[PDB]
Design a protein around this ligand. Sequence first.
Ligand SMILES: O=C1Cc2cc(Nc3ncncc3Cl)ccc2N1
Ligand SMILES: O=C1Cc2cc(Nc3ncncc3Cl)ccc2N1
Ligand SMILES: [Cl-]
Ligand SMILES: [Cl-]
Lengths: 4, 4, 124, 124
Amino acid sequence: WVIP
Amino acid sequence: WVIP
Amino acid sequence: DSCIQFTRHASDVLLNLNRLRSRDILTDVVIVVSREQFRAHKTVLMACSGLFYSIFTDQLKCNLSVINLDPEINPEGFCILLDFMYTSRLNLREGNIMAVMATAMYLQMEHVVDTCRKFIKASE
Amino acid sequence: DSCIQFTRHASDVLLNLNRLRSRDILTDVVIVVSREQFRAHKTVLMACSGLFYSIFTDQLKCNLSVINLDPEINPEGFCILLDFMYTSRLNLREGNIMAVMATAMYLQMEHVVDTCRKFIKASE
Ligand SMILES: O=C1Cc2cc(Nc3ncncc3Cl)ccc2N1
Ligand SMILES: O=C1Cc2cc(Nc3ncncc3Cl)ccc2N1
Ligand SMILES: [Cl-]
Ligand SMILES: [Cl-]
């Protein structure tokens, strides 16, 4: 999971 | 396009 | 093999599937959650959820145009997860994390369940 | 927004759509190429091809279970492109590049047309  |  | 690969292909496909959903094009099922209705594509739901995969591979249920979820399922939690299925983006907030995790457990969306567990553990 | 994003989501969705294609699950159309038949999902074809997008948004054609391609279309070129649609991998070879490019132009798959043009230009 990432900060888009 | 890339070499997978 | 000796294939070449187009890096952005999968993302572009999902973006187009979401554009078809927005315009209600070729949607083939309605998901009913506490009298809130969501139109979707059976194949995308199956590709994202262990529950929908099991439902639409069933010889009788594969032909249903309406699926009713368990009444304990929250429509907002479902809406957030349906958006995630079609975009890869999860709108996870302090005010919805419990409903989102409960819905992801029911829908059998293991990666969503994993990030909810981790975000909850960080707040304790 | 304040969304989080699951990097591998789009790729995992496409992988699952290809598994449904392999097992012939929920395929809703047959594409006929020079008497060679290919089963697929209308939504995936639309998501990848300008031609299929135009065909299945047509009020009469959206309901067809069989689509016949132009007889000049080569079945191997189509097969390679259908595989690309479901995997992001293009099996481009000296022996098939002309058929693949001609099929991609007809199907309106601009990124495939682009890499074929470049690979051909490198060999001249
Ligand atoms: O967490 C998850 C996400 C998910 C998706 C599916 N889908 C499929 N699996 C295998 N072949 C085809 C498909 Cl469509 C099954 C289980 C789970 N569990
Ligand atoms: O090269 C290409 C690839 C491609 C895909 C599509 N598909 C869609 N476009 C817009 N909204 C939904 C969909 Cl399904 C249309 C044109 C082209 N041209
Ligand atoms: Cl997931
Ligand atoms: Cl393309």
